[PDB]
């Protein structure tokens, strides 16, 4: 019964080191079950992230039409499995960026349920 909205917070929100992703991918349970190959963390307030659902409507990478792109670039961290990464000893490279985020939005209230892209 983890809601769709709560799953997005768990997977993608860090409103608050080159070791960041090793730390965070385990801390949010993205290394339980598998090494999730790619993950993005957004370092903005939840309110700023939820407000993107009110921003520029754009197609999601898979062709869905309920995605929204932020007007400003936002503070993010990319996490990406390393070559020596093999389950259950996952390992990640951290790359910081400032990019527009794209999310898919659902529900009432209308909030992000999928992190789609950064550009």
């Amino acid at each position, epitope marked *: 019964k983890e809601t769709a909205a709560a799953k997005f917070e768990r997977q993608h929100m860090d409103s608050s080191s080159s070791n960041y992703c090793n730390q965070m991918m385990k801390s949010r349970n993205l290394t339980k079950d598998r090494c999730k190959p790619v993950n993005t963390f957004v370092h903005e307030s939840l309110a700023d992230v939820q407000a993107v659902c*009110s921003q520029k409507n754009v197609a999601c990478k898979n062709g869905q039409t309920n995605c929204y792109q932020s007007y400003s670039t936002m503070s993010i961290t990319d996490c990406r499995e390393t070559g020596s990464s093999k389950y259950p000893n996952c390992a990640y490279k951290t790359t910081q960026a400032n990019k527009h985020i794209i999310v898919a939005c659902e529900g009432n209230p209308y909030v992000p349920v999928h992190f789609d892209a950064s550009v």
Partner: nanobody, 123 residues
Framework: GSQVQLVESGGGLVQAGGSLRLSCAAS????????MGWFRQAPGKEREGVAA????????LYADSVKGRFTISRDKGKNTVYLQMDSLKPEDTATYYC??????????????WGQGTQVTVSS
């Protein structure tokens, strides 16, 4: 000004077998809504998508029960969407809602909703 509004017009009371048009024009949103559509909630029933269409006038979708009777259209380069409803049946009686910014006829994916317009088809 500051707020998005989906202004719904048209609808109302008609005899079974009659025709009505619903209209929806969005203001305050400064980009295309890729999909807009009409949903309804009839007495005793859950909300359901009725028709939807994309911003280029394609990707048209209808609920099975209204195909051939209802016609959705959009103004190109504007966020307006219309529903011509012919051959109306009593079970088309419902609150109709404009919806914008979602995906196809999936209601949970739409984030902007009109207040709802009654359509009442008598018998």
């Amino acid at each position: 000004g500051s707020q998005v509004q989906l202004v719904e017009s048209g609808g109302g009371l008609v005899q079974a077998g009659g025709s009505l048009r619903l209209s929806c024009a969005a203001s305050g949103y400064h980009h295309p809504y890729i999909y807009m559509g009409w949903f309804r909630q009839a007495p005793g029933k859950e909300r359901e998508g009725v028709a939807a269409m994309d911003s280029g006038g394609g990707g048209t979708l209808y609920a099975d029960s209204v195909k051939g009777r209802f016609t959705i259209s959009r103004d190109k380069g504007k966020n307006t969407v219309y529903l011509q409803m012919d051959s109306l049946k009593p079970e088309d009686t419902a609150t109709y809602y404009c919806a914008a910014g979602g995906h196809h006829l999936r209601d949970h994916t739409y984030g902007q909703w009109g207040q709802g317009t009654q359509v009442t088809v008598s018998s």
